[PDB]
Each structure stands twice: as structure tokens, then as C-alpha cells.
């Protein structure tokens, strides 16, 4: 859904449609998300600080 | 192996003309595709002749 905002999500309504179903058959109790960082010429290129 | 939420045909898994041996009890080989089941489990391992 396109929007022009930073924070404090709008009050508009939008449903969610499924895309694909995954039949694992195994319970899940924990989850974690992944992010991608950039290594430009400004940073030294080491993933320490 | 566990298979769920998939529609597959065994005909191509039989017309390879390369399997040395074949065995299947309980259901006729020519009428198991129509007979619908819930889940199919594959037990893959190696063994001597
Ligand atoms: C939940 O996962 C654990 C770890 O595999 C398993 O021992 C347990 O039987 C599972 N519970 C159910 C209801 O499937």
C-alpha cells in the first residue's frame, strides 16, 4: 500500500490477501527479522563499529 | 520427507525406464493416482544389493 508518511500510521483501511501457503507441519515458538546494511566509501568496510 | 499442499503425478516417476526393481503393496500401481490420501512420506536411504 503506497503512503507518504514517516511514523504514526494512518487510520485508513486495507485488507491483506494471501500469496502462498507453507505446510511445514512443525510448530514455531521464536522468530527474528533480517536487515541489510551498506558498505560505501565513507565507512572503512569492517562490521565492527 | 514430508509433502503437503502439492498436486503431483506419479506417471512420470514410473516412465523413466531406468529403475531396476519396483515394489508396492496395499494398493494397485495403476489405480493409486486416483485414490486420494492426505500425506506422502519418502524414506530415502542406501543399501547393498
Ligand atoms: C512442539 O515442538 C517440539 C519440539 O520439536 C515437539 O517436541 C512438540 O511435540 C511440538 N508440539 C506439538 C503440539 O506439535
Amino acid at each position: 500500500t503506497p503512503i507518504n508518511l514517516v511514523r504514526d500510521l494512518p487510520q485508513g483501511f486495507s485488507a491483506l490477501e494471501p500469496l502462498v501457503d507453507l505446510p511445514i507441519g512443525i510448530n514455531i515458538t521464536r522468530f527474528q527479522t533480517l536487515l541489510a546494511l551498506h558498505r560505501s566509501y565513507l565507512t572503512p568496510g569492517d562490521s565492527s563499529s | 520427507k514430508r509433502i503437503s499442499n502439492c498436486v503431483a503425478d506419479y506417471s512420470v516417476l514410473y516412465n523413466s525406464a531406468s529403475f531396476s526393481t519396483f515394489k508396492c503393496y496395499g494398493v494397485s500401481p495403476t489405480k493409486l493416482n486416483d485414490l486420494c490420501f492426505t500425506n506422502v512420506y519418502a524414506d530415502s536411504f542406501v543399501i547393498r544389493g
Side-chain angles (χ1 to χ4, degrees), chain A residues 21-26, chain B residues 2-6 39:
Chain A
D21 186 278
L22 188 153
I24 179 174
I26 307 297
Chain B
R2 276 211 67 256
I3 295 289
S4 297
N5 293 347
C6 158
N39 288 306

Side-chain angles (χ1 to χ4, degrees), chain A residues 2-37:
Chain A
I3 210 64
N4 185 24
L5 199 58
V6 192
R7 59 190 178 274
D8 208 341
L9 304 178
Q11 284 85 62
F13 205 95
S14 291
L16 307 179
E17 300 93 6
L19 296 195
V20 73
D21 186 278
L22 188 153
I24 179 174
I26 307 297
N27 52 4
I28 317 170
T29 193
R30 288 199 311 176
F31 75 103
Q32 191 261 330
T33 183
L34 305 179
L35 276 77
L37 60 87

Side-chain angles (χ1 to χ4, degrees), chain B residues 17-33:
Chain B
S18 69
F19 302 141
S20 45
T21 73
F22 187 88
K23 189 257 287 182
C24 185
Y25 299 148
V27 71
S28 64
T30 60
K31 284 305 143 334
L32 43 84
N33 202 70

